[PDB]
Amino acid sequence: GPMGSMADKIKCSHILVKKQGEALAVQERLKAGEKFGKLAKELSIDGGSAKRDGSLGYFGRGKMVKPFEDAAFRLQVGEVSEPVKSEFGYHVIKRLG
Numbered sequence: 001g002p003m004g005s006m007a008d009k010i011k012c013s014h015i016l017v018k019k020q021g022e023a024l025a026v027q028e029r030l031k032a033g034e035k036f037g038k039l040a041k042e043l044s045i046d047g048g049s050a051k052r053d054g055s056l057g058y059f060g061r062g063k064m065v066k067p068f069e070d071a072a073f074r075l076q077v078g079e080v081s082e083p084v085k086s087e088f089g090y091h092v093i094k095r096l097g
Contacts, residue, residue, distance in 0.1 A: 009058030010072045011097020015039050016046035016089045023090040027080035036080075036094035045089070058097065068093065 013036045017023050026039055037053025044050045056064070056072075064072055071081035071093050078095040085091070 007058070007097075009060045010056075010076075010095070011058050012056050012072050012075070012093050012095045013037060013040070013054040014046065014049075014056055014064075014068065015044040015054055015092040016050070017043055017092075018045060018089060020083060020085070020090045023083045023092055027083070027092055030080045030092075030094055036092075036096060039092075055096065065091075067091075 015026065015036065017026070022043065026043065030036060030039065037055060040046065040050045040054040044054060046054060059072060061069065063069070065086040065088075067084045067086050068091055071084055075081050075093060075095050081093040083090055084093070
């Protein structure tokens with residue numbers, strides 16, 4: 001039982017790309033060994049938020065969009081989630097905490 005209690009929130013990151021086809025690719029290549037945050041500045045078009053490597057950090061039920069928040073707590077394994085398109089664009093989610 002190592003130190004690290006309390007985890008009501010989810011610790012994930014997000015990326016955005018207009019080329020919806022890439023979103024499907026990055027998710028594939030993301031696990032290749034590259035860091036999610038890297039893609040943030042690499043190909044992610046996400047505004048300022050991308051400057052923080054998309055480090056969404058601990059979020060709860062009421063911070064991200066409905067489609068995103070849903071996939072936010074679905075990939076507890078720590079992987080990329082299906083191409084989620086919100087009012088912002090084609091999002092991506094890789095658990096990181």
